Amino acid sequence: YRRLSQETTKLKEERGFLLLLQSPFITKLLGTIRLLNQMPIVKLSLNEVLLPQLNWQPTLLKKLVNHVLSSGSWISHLIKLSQYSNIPICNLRLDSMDYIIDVLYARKLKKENIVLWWNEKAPLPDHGGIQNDFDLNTSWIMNDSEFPKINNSGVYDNVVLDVGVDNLTVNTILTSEFVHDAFSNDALNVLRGMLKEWWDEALKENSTADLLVNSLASWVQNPNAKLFDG
Amino acid sequence: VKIQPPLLRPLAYRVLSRKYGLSIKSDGLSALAEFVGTNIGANWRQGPATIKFLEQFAAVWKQQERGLFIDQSGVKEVIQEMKERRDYFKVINASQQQRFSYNPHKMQFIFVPNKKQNGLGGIAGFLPDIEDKVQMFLTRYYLTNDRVMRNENFQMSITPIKNLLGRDAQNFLLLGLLNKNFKGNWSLEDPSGSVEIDISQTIPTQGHYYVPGCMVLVEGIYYSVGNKFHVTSMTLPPGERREITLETIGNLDLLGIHGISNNNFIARLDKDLKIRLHLLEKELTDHKFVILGANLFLDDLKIMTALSKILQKLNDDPPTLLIWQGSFTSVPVFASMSSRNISSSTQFKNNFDALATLLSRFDNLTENTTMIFIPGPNDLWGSMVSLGASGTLPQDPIPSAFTKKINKVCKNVVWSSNPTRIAYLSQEIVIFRDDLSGRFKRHRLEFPFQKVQETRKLVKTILDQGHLSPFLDSLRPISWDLDHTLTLCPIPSTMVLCDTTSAQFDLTYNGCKVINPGSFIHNRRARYMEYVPSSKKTIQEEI
Amino acid sequence: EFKDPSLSLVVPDFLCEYCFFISDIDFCKAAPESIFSCVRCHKAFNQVLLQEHLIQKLRSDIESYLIQDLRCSRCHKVKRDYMSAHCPCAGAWEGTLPRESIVQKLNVFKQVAKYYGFDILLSCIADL
Ligand SMILES: [Zn+2]
Ligand SMILES: [Zn+2]
């Protein structure tokens, strides 16, 4: 169990390279070996791996072989995302799409004259310290997430069309003082223009823009992403 | 020698039915038979020893209940006799606190049956009924008014709000909930009625945090042109000491360790108080308890290193009670929308599993000291809905599903609510973990017109108002029935007023001593504080 | 007289990362092999997330009941006094959220937690 340090040291004094890291205990492995802080490392956390308690050799072999022979495609995708998003290599993750949206939206607002209300390690917007206080209106607006529906029972002898609606949230976003529950319309217009240019770029053969527009709604819902607001 | 019950029956029956006692059951006869079997010998010819042992049985059994029946427990009183030929302190949470109501017209506290003991509780018994929120402010006002009336200075008389309707150009003294009406003006509420206030020429009594929701004594002149009470001075009601507060109800067993009261009868005790006081006066230095700072995080390496440095020092000399307070996770736990990484609940469970490993190398502390854990603002249950913000005050303890290894590693661990009460031999302690300085500073009411004074004002206000949370339902929602746990009545001797926004201090006032532990880590220094039960303090740090 | 032989317990806006797809889910009325998988893609859901969201819903329900308002009996005006015996007219206050509704909801939570193997939700209930 001590050979990890020896291998890391020999790799350090044999070559100056990037390291692919994949484990459910990324911070623990970073803290166990002190030589890891001296090299640029890219993290590729895909956790929640388990054993079948029997015949684990072929499944772990499959995992390792697909990882090693798909690392090329993984790094190609990471290079594409980085060279499009103006973000360094080691600050990106394959599934961390919300971070790019956060940084670009914050940059656009910084070029504007609007306070970012940026927050870290806390899923609440920064309001100057007032946000930690309990309030009736806020507590009512977080928990009213139910969506109504219409159902008219009966027997129909006529033909009925079963249709499906897609991309409703993006259309709603793009289309359309006194009131205290109102969200700042400046930010709304800023993000509307952002989404419009996003749609235009995704139209002209851009996979990254299409994927980011797809993930926009999940970013909106998820409070774990920074720059969140109820 | 195996006896015949018929030839023993008269000896028991005479003593337990003619001189003293009554209603001996068959199991009582069997227990007395086996007792005679143990103390066998020259019996049925030995007078004194058997009858004095029966008198000792009476002296053991008459105190329990009423002693008019003897069930299978006869062996239990026999064992009591055998064993009659630190302990005596308890820690209680807000969930199991005894419920005592109040009635103004008779001016006595009234016991209320506990829904846990008499109710079923199979599905949902913890839900309070509707009228509790109606009666909670009434009870608070009643207690405050009684406290004001018992004061030596006030024997001048206050007048109800509603009686101010017909007169004018006369000064009055009143008290009531100072808050905001629906329109947006400041008003005083009384069980009779409400009026509008005037602040433009108000001179206050300095040293008080005038916050909406606190009872205030108001002096001014009424005017019937509108509905404006032109105030000239505002002052919080004064306080009272523990002895005078108690003596009005004798020495009630509210936090009863010797005995408890119920709906059938009421109890009292003062004979053992001086005995317990003298017992406390000796071997008190050996019975030391140490508390740490707040917001101690079980995720970063620096806090673990500091805790290991503290534990290696504390292992050789284990204290009696060790209290762990503050939030144990630096990030609030809530719903996880990612299935690719470690879930928040699993990470929270993992944070405590390391503590079980770190306690394995300190067997002295584990073996000789009990553990106390107190939830913080953003533990599992609160931050589940409040997401790290303030919420309901009677917080549930840490769930048992996330502490399955601490209870096996250590032989004495207790999880309590945010307000918790411990009853020593002659001391009662309340611990209350939350922020007060910012709450009072931000919502301080304005009047048109060196860091030790802020804590002075905080202590003075919190002791004069006599309630842990002098705020309305809008700011801090409170459970409808458990509000009695937050009432500051028969005020405790010592308050562990943990606050992350106030400097450490050791103030004492009005017969009550208050201690204010700070954050466990600050400016690359770690600080923890130990209190000697002899009204002496010590502060120690390890870099 | 015919009635509905089953109750309803719906969790709104459950997200599938493999599709960025948003839909509700009924823990009582919907058949199995659909609670544990996405509607469009046939990818299994994570169970502890489901149980955590159920706990979130239950705690939010309890808080919402505890933070309710009071309404008069005869007239339906809202209570506007921090302390008062009853309405200026005849009638006593009643809560907007009745007790029987939340009692039945807790009962259906018990039934749901008993049908499937949900130890964490059982421990969540047992701590009350
Ligand atoms: Zn899917
Ligand atoms: Zn009415």
DSSP class per residue in chain A: --HHHHHHHHHHHH----EEE--TTHHHHHHH-GGGGGS-EEE---------SS-HHHHHHHHHHHHHHHHHHHHHHHHHHHHHHT--GGG--SS-HHHHHHHHHHHHHHHTT------SSSSS--SSSGGGS--HHHHHHHH--------------S---------HHHHHHHH----TT---HHHHHHHHHHHHHHHHHHHTT-HHHHHHHHHHHHHHH-SSSSS---
- Our CA-based measurement puts residue C12 at a distance from the nearest CA of chain A, in whole angstroms, of 6
Question: What is the experimental resolution, given in Å to one decimal place?
Answer: 3.7
Structure tokens at B239: 């306080």
Cα within 13 Å of Cα(B365), Cβ side: 20
- Our CA-based measurement puts residue B318 at a distance from the nearest CA of chain A, in whole angstroms, of 31
Name the experiment that determined this structure. Answer: cryo-EM
- Rounded to a whole number of angstroms, the distance between the first and last alpha carbons of chain B is 72
Is the distance from CB of C35 to CB of C25 less than 8 angstroms?
A: yes
- Our CA-based measurement puts residue B395 at a distance from the nearest CA of chain C, in whole angstroms, of 11
Q: How far is C-alpha C64 from the geometric centre of its chain's CA atoms?
A: 10
| Residues forming beta bridges with residue B425, ordered by sequence position | none
Q: Is A47 on the interface with B (CB under 8 A)?
A: yes
Residues of C with Cβ-Cβ distance to B383 under 8 angstroms: none
Q: Within 10 Å of residue B459's Cβ, how many Cβ atoms?
A: 21
**Cα–Cα separations (whole angstroms), residue A132 to B210, B378, B532:** 21, 11, 35
Is the distance from CB of B337 to CB of C53 less than 8 angstroms?
A: no
| Residue where the block lists tokens 């103390």 | B39
> Of A26, A50, A132, which to mutate for an interface test with B (greatest number of B Cβ within 10 Å)?
A132
Structure tokens at B183: 């329109």
**Cα–Cα separations (whole angstroms), residue B367 to B286, B312, B318, B371:** 16, 15, 9, 11
Q: Is the dihedral of CA A78, A81, A85, A86 positive or negative?
A: positive
Three-state SS at C2: coil
Tell me the C-alpha distance between B148 and B238, whole Å.
Answer: 7
Q: Is A145 on the interface with C (CB under 8 A)?
A: yes
Structure tokens at C42: 């046939």
State the distance from the centre of ligand 2 to the C-alpha of B127, rounded, in angstroms: 26
Structure tokens at C59: 């705690």
Q: What is the 3-state secondary structure (H, E, C) of A214-225?
A: HHHHHHHHCCCC
Q: What is the DSSP letter of C29?
A: T
Residues 6+ apart with CB under 8 A from A41: A18, A19, A21, A90
Is the distance from CB of B129 to CB of C65 less than 8 angstroms?
A: no
**Which amino acid is present at A37?**
N
**Which amino acid is present at B385?**
V
Three-state SS at B178: strand
- Rounded to a whole number of angstroms, the distance between the first and last alpha carbons of chain A is 48
Q: What is the DSSP letter of B487?
A: B
Structure tokens at A216: 């926009």
Q: What is the largest CA-CA distance in chain B?
A: 98
Residues of A with Cβ-Cβ distance to B389 under 8 angstroms: 124, 131-134
Tell me the C-alpha distance between C114 and B180, whole Å.
Answer: 48
The residues spanned by each domain of chain B are 89-152+237-543, 156-236
Burial of residue A122, with CB atoms counted within 10 A of its CB: 0-12 exposed, 13-18 middle, 19 or more buried: middle
Structure tokens at B115: 């829904």
State the distance from the centre of ligand 2 to the C-alpha of C92, rounded, in angstroms: 7
State the distance from the centre of ligand 2 to the C-alpha of B484, rounded, in angstroms: 29
Tell me the C-alpha distance between C96 and C89, whole Å.
Answer: 19
Q: What is the largest CA-CA distance in chain A?
A: 80
Give the number of whichever ligand sits closest to the CA of residue C14: 1
Tell me the C-alpha distance between B31 and B24, whole Å.
Answer: 11
